[PDB]
Symmetry: C3
Subunit: 402 residues, 3 copies
């Protein structure tokens, strides 16, 4: 992919330039600002497509693209993704890769899920404050959960309406097309932006060793989680429901997992994994003809885990402890973000700002995660492919009523 | 109505549970919070449909559903409703059921009617402040009058456009359908919410007697106003315009008023009141074929009076004196709220938050009003039916040009 | 034009009433407030159509109404308008008609061009603050550049889509029609509003001589700029590109410039200037059949210059020095405002609030500018007509590939 290769070239460049300036001399604060600036603009542009993207995606999907076995597949996907995101959260909290009022927080979480006002939720959200007299107060920051929730309601309502809602459906389809064009164009400007951010981040970092160590630890944490979710959770769930050998199930797909790593894209891995389940496992083409394609765009357990660990890592590196609700916000958004990062084209950096915007984090340290995304990409892709295959086996096993 | 009966069952339950907990022991503040919480969410959900509801209703109505006699009917309706709402206001201020800078307030009222910005008006509104240097400042709280006003302008503008605006009209029709589905679904969750609110309200109340006394006084105040508007104002206006016996006019409709109480629904009272004016009064089927049906969804004088007295009662119980503008805001919103509470299905609790949101009141004490709405419902229904009948007589009398 | 004559009659009236009250006695502050009040409402109404107008105009234009020679015409127009607006800015700063952190300001300018959030930008915008620790902070005031920019992106994206975006295009066309009806209706209420504002402004002014002197100086400044742009810049550019006699080019059009002054409307001047270039200069009817009509609604160099000098004059009279970014905001909005004041019907007062809202100025002193707009209108009209003629010559000269 020209842009993936372009983004990595930009990273290297950005990195080399930052290193050169640092070893050359201590850069003036105003000049570091001007150095990282074209990265600020990359974020500002992407972050300004989040809201329209959330609204069009939710309403275009839940209406436009809505049997029993289909229900089974969706249940497996959502369940596995929530599992993956929760694993991510536990590991990033335990491992703590990033190195720097209980009921009330969850109470606010639940309030922010029903924003008193749609508009205001687009930029701010409710918080509890202690005065020992508690109050609600606004705090800046878009209510991602507030809006996602209400638009889910709205989309499910329209969807039920039927051809009566045709017009509004078509309008929102057009909107989604326009916003996706803009995301594509911005991600084309991304390589420069990422280069500038990395060059700036290096010039600011006080001890390369510490930051290098933290980022490496984050990568291992993402790695560990991909292994546990795919190597243990997926296979165990297979057995618990199928009572069959997960290794026997996995033995056949070896070619499929290989294509997964090889193509680094479920889309390109898709025809091989058709073959591997139809021929080797002998899964009914029906189940194979639905679970595989649907999963290729929504079942992204590896993506969700990466997105949760990354969000708490950025939190941690910024000396910010997330409250119980903020952690639930990460888990909820991480799952949605992965079903998006999978559907929306070149939306890898959009979704990560969505999760960070949702927890109210800096959103600048997103640059470090990019510097290493290219290594973690292979694994996370393969994890997503594996899950879809297990799902097809599970759906087929749970579909013997026939 | 399963839901009306459900809501009353919920009230009783809520009440019994609150009473039990109170007589059992003093509940911890955090636990009372968790008790009333599912009521907080009922409000948060309803209040989040106000804005879309205001926009779709105004634009779908003033465009989609827009002779001389028709003009006459609308004039009578709007006039009588404003009269009913003003009577409500005077009585609630005089009686004062709830028991706890002149020009500037009306000046702000007039400003808030033309919000400098549509978006900002969706969550905040202009106020005057004294520094002896006066200034305008924002104060949180959706500009209900700001938005209603501008959308009235917008809808009247589209309406005139004609079939040219077809598309935009159809789009907003679909929106209105979706938002009404959501209001219906939430009001289904209402019974639990109302029960929780009442249980909490009882646990907090310090002296049951005082609150019981206040709520009873509010009910009598609503009652008195229904009597004065229907028993005096309506009949007097009939004579002043018709110069005929209002008792002679009322004598025939007795059956109609009975059905009104019996069906507790103008809709179910509708065929009887057709009969009562066509047969007994001998009103021309033409006038009867328009005034009755149009009124059955817009002429709600009893509803407007209830909605104004309730709004100032909630104000009063909360030790808040309304300024001259806030009182005008209640009168204006109360009239619109009654034409809505009449059109929008199961919108009894939505409209009351609209009036409270408009005056910027607590919006939680709405629970007490629900506890007694079921008693006042009968009377207010009959008052609305009576007004429509008088209107048909007045329109027919004012339509002898023919 | 009944309304132009009405607006001037209102000015005279307003002025006479203000003068009478002032010579009669010192008016009470509350009564001056009530005097100017119906002007406040004129602004509040107009300013509340800016946002919808910006959105519908940008999306209806850049999509609905989008060869080489056509590209040439647009380049000439945009270039000449930016030149005109910059001349305006320099002159108003130099002459200083109105009589009362470098990089950071431009950095904010560039940020406000990519608002992190669409909604929030509709009412507020980013600023740098010094604590010696710099921060970004919100400051009230709609991000005109933020929204214009993003909608330009959105419209260009839809435009490319093609007939696929038909629906959304038609929807926004309808919206634009509705908003334009409202602007027309408000400008009908303008005469009273302007009269009230002028009556109030006179009653407040402490020294008529000083204010009279300042306004006269502003008029000369607008005059000087119209002369320099039309008398020097336009003709020079003609020669630089054509290497032909600008006087020989101008000699023929004399009749065209006359109609310009005579009709005080490029629209009415349009058939004469067709004649003057086709017959006298002998410009190919093709170029004449495009450059003239397109320019008659977008090439408004005289309008842009007026709008920049006016914006900085209102700034200056209000003892407000504009930062480097605010000046660029004026130049950018002034150009857009002139292409609008030209397209949108009776949008002379809307566009001036847009420029003032963009720089965050009082927006009330707009009354003085109206008091003298009628004199400056003749000249600015003729300047716009002249530019279109020069453009036709330049486009024809640059189009001899043929
Ligand atoms: C010195 C300061 C430097 C500051 C940072 C960089 C500033 C420049 C950014 C830039 O040009 O962005 C490149 C980007 C990407 O363009 P690109 O040319 O770099 O890559 C895409 C190219 N194609 C389409 C051929 C594949 O411009 C865009 O197209 C952005 C689209 C989204 C817009 C969202 C709102 C923000 C922009 C508002 C202004 C609109 C202008 C029109 C844009 C075109 C739309 C179709
Ligand atoms: C412990 C804390 C308790 C806190 C309070 C209760 C929280 C639960 C509230 C709840 O479930 O609401 C019931 C309500 C009502 O559902 P219901 O099942 O109770 O009643 C309606 C049922 N039918 C349709 C069959 C007649 O859910 C809704 O449908 C709400 C619709 C409006 C949504 C507006 C935004 C708020 C919700 C955002 C989240 C979206 C989820 C999808 C909802 C379905 C939409 C079609
Ligand atoms: C004492 C205090 C005085 C305060 C200032 C004046 C207040 C009155 C202003 C006024 O009436 O405006 C006249 C204006 C202009 O009406 P007009 O009658 O003066 O001039 C236009 C007349 N025709 C159409 C025949 C050419 O009313 C409008 O039509 C305004 C349209 C834009 C609305 C934007 C939002 C603000 C208004 C919200 C309220 C809506 C009411 C309906 C308006 C009609 C819409 C089709
Ligand atoms: C036979 O197969 C049938 C199948 C049916 C598909 O149904 C759709 C239902 C909604 C769903 C799951 C779909 C696609 C995009 C999904 C969205 C991506 C967006 O991303 C987010 C997060 C990140 C933001 C940047 C944007 O918004 C979410 C809120 C948004 C999202 C998760 C909302 C839900 C959407 C699929 C067809 O599948 C193609
Ligand atoms: C022959 O008969 C012809 C007749 C013509 C009807 O014309 C329509 C004109 C607008 C009007 C009066 C109508 C219905 C809903 C009315 C709305 C209910 C909403 O409620 C509110 C307040 C409460 C909020 C929760 C929502 O918004 C208002 C702002 C909204 C409202 C009052 C705006 C005005 C609307 C009727 C047909 O009648 C069916
Ligand atoms: C053969 O001829 C072809 C030609 C093609 C025309 O293409 C269109 C492209 C967009 C353009 C330049 C056009 C008309 C209105 C223009 C708008 C007026 C508005 O005014 C503003 C400022 C003032 C505000 C009050 C409203 O918004 C701008 C943001 C808005 C504006 C400048 C955005 C750009 C628009 C012409 C046809 O021409 C008729
Ligand atoms: C100010 C910017 C444009 C300077 C250049 C920065 C680099 C990193 C970026 C920014 C915009 C990018 C281009 C924008 C879009 C395209 C079209 C696509 O089909 C191939 C890649 C190509 C041609 C990109 C190559 C790299 C690019 C030039
Ligand atoms: C958490 C909630 C759901 C617990 C139950 C609370 C009670 C008061 C409410 C909430 C939702 C309600 C249900 C939602 C919708 C319907 C469908 C309708 O056609 C009949 C009533 C029925 C079946 C309602 C009965 C009462 C109900 C169960
Ligand atoms: C409160 C207002 C209405 C008082 C009058 C103020 C004056 C200055 C204004 C306000 C509204 C204006 C009218 C509104 C619209 C029209 C219709 C148009 O085809 C001719 C002019 C005419 C008839 C205007 C004449 C002047 C007018 C009466």
């Amino acid at each position: 992919n020209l842009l993936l290769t372009l983004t990595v070239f930009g990273v290297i460049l950005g990195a080399v330039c930052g290193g050169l300036l640092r070893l050359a001399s201590p850069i003036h604060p105003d000049v570091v600002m001007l150095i990282a600036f074209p990265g600020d603009i990359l974020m500002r542009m992407l972050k300004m497509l989040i809201l329209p993207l959330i609204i069009s995606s939710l309403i275009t999907g839940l209406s436009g693209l809505d049997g029993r076995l289909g229900t089974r597949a969706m249940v497996y996907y959502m369940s596995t993704t929530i599992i993956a995101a929760v694993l991510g959260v536990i590991l990033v909290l335990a491992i703590h890769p990033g190195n720097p009022s209980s009921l009330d927080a969850f109470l606010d979480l639940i309030r922010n899920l029903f924003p008193e006002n749609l508009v205001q939720a687009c930029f701010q959200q409710i918080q509890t404050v202690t005065k020992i007299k508690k109050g609600l107060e606004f705090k800046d920051g878009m209510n991602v959960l507030g809006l996602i929730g209400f638009f889910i309601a709205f989309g499910i309502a329209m969807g039920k309406m039927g051809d009566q809602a045709k017009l509004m459906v078509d309008f929102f389809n057009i909107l989604n097309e326009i916003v996706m064009k803009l995301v594509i164009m911005i991600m084309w400007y991304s390589p420069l932006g990422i280069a500038c951010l990395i060059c700036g981040k290096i010039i600011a970092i006080k001890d390369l060793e510490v930051v290098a160590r933290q980022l490496g630890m984050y990568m291992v944490t993402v790695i560990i989680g991909l292994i546990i979710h795919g190597g243990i959770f997926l296979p165990l769930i297979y057995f618990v429901v199928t009572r069959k050998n997960p290794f026997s199930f996995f033995a056949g797909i070896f070619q499929a997992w290989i294509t997964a790593l090889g193509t680094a894209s479920s889309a390109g891995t898709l025809p091989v994994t058709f073959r591997c389940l139809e021929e080797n496992l002998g899964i009914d083409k029906r189940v194979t003809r639905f679970v595989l394609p649907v999963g290729a765009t929504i079942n992204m357990d590896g993506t969700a885990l990466y997105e949760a660990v990354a969000a708490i890592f950025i939190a941690q590196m910024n000396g910010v402890v997330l409250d119980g609700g903020q952690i639930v916000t990460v888990s909820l958004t991480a799952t949605l973000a992965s079903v998006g990062a999978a559907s929306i084209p070149s939306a890898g950096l959009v979704t990560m700002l969505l999760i960070l915007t949702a927890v109210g984090l800096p959103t600048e340290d997103i640059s470090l995660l990019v510097a290493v995304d290219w290594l973690l990409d292979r694994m996370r892709t393969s994890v997503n492919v594996v899950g879809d295959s297990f799902g097809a086996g599970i759906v087929y096993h749970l579909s013997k009523s026939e």
